[PDB]
Amino acid sequence: GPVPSRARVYTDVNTHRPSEYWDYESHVVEWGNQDDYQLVRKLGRGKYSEVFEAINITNNEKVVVKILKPVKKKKIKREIKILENLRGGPNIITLADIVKDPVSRTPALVFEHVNNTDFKQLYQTLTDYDIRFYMYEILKALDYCHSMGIMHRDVKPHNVMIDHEHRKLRLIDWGLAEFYHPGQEYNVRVASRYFKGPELLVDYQMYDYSLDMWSLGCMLASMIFRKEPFFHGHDNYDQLVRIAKVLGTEDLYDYIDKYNIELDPRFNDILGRHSRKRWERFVHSENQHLVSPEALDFLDKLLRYDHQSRLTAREAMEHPYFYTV
Amino acid sequence: PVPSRARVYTDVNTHRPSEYWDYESHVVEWGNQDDYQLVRKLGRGKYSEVFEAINITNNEKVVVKILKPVKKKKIKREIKILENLRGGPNIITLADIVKDPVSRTPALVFEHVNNTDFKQLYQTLTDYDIRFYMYEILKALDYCHSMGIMHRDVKPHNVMIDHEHRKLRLIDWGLAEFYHPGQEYNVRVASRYFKGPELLVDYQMYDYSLDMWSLGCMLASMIFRKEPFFHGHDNYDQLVRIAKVLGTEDLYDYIDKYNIELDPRFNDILGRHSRKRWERFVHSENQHLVSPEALDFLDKLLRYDHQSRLTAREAMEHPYFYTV
Ligand SMILES: O=C(CCNCc1ccc(-c2ccccc2)c(Cl)c1)NCCC(=O)Nc1cccc(C(=O)O)c1
Ligand SMILES: O=C(CCNCc1ccc(-c2ccccc2)c(Cl)c1)NCCC(=O)Nc1cccc(C(=O)O)c1
16 A cells, blocks of 8 residues: 655644644534625635625624535534634634524625735736745745644635735635644545645645645746646646656656555556756746746745655745745 | 823824724734743733743743733734834833634733842842833833833833843733823723822823823832832722822812812812822831932822823933933
């Protein structure tokens, strides 16, 4: 079978906490009356949720309301417990209330108000400094949630709220987040395709916080190279081929051999043979103002097949790429 | 009642954006308390417990104040004030804000402070020492007043003295508030013995001058070795203790000036009292701490009329401090 693995940091933080902290299945959820909130407009729609801008009628303050389709009560309890555990953490979306509409009985989460900057406009105006600044803000959120024994498992641009006018950032949608327990085998069907770590694609279940650092690297690559997404897979098998076209196939075999991973036969006629590419290959006239030797060295240290070889969020915060923030 | 406003730093908050003073909208962020290990208890209060602690990541001593979340509004107020005042002369420095993962109880992390043996401090402190530390408190008050904040709980328990390093900090900003001209404040602030007459007569439009009354109470207890100086047994009796020294004539002049309605519960306890000479409180055990300059300075702090008290900046110019 595959060789076991464990996080290099915050390995036993949940082991040493009482069960109430991490046993979300036993967590008792309480909610108030949604009659105190009026929905204003839709902000987003997903598979198991709809997010709205809303107003609390009792204090005239804007909030965000996430209405949850109750596909699994277990999943609702998990997201709520994680949000309650992380509440007030740096750049973590703040859960302000939990409510239920009296007639539909549909539960909803109420968050601090957030104001998303026009993304298409943001993507063209962000400078080299802005990218470093916001990447550092994401790292504060990741180091905090990892220190709190939680993996986000869905780091991607859609799950990062930037209010550029206020230089404010929040890491949002904790619906896929999970508690880290050393040796635990997790479901690999997490994260969104372009942001999936190679551990998920090769079906290595004993992953950890380092999965978030791979997804973060994917976001950094897309921002500095102006290539969205950076690894453009068309399916989950093709996603690994897109990564191998950059990192090369030699190091992919070194990774699967190190953890004694059995590579799915469906990869046999699509993976091919690929040399390790230089990150400088992705520099072009449209992105060269965002690229520097520090950015490429930092990117190289995130985008590694070996999950244990990636920088932790705390190590990443010490990188020279952030010396100006 | 007749409205009143501060003689100094009157509009400092009016002229600053809402983000500075609007604590209810202040977004609090905290780290993981897992990086701190508690060493010993330093004090216990109604809504907090203070510990000496160690940051395990750098092996540096700090102080950790664990807050009982009686009101989130009160927590936001103390945090915003501490963040606004951070680095101010003799103001306790807020170094971090954390939360214990399991209890979810928020805690404030301060620079390390080392309180000198208090029982030893009283008899060892000289006339110079009292002038030196009084001046250190005044630097902190002039700074926080200039920053549009009144402490509202000046008392010995809220002054940290590290005598070996001649270091002072004004601590526990849990009752502090932003000054806005014309605002009516809750009079149920400060500790009984340090309450200004404005609070005792229920005059809500008070200002930074409340801190100068409390400071005067501390000065009187130090130079005369009478702890506390105005020993009230309840909030009504507290005003009678002040009147036994300042006299009832000037108390009526004060309430008439601001058209204050005196609570009927004072009727059969206030009595009639002459204005006393400060020299009356001098004795063999305290005469080495008293001087004409000390009594003149004390007289200028302990006045009924909040507008007639020295400001922290005026107090720093007094001859009592010519040696510091
Ligand atoms: O789609 C979005 C976010 C969209 N962000 C776009 C975006 C994110 C990051 C960057 C960036 C990253 C690194 C460096 C520099 C820049 C950029 Cl350029 C754009 N939001 C709309 C929907 C929404 O706000 N949802 C929401 C809000 C609050 C809570 C929840 C929740 O599920 O808890 C959901
Ligand atoms: O009780 C105390 C302080 C106790 N000070 C006693 C004291 C204070 C003033 C003088 C003095 C006044 C005028 C002239 C000369 C001297 C003297 Cl003689 C003694 N501290 C123990 C607990 C503690 O340190 N609390 C603390 C520390 C840091 C921050 C906080 C906080 O709430 O932020 C609280």
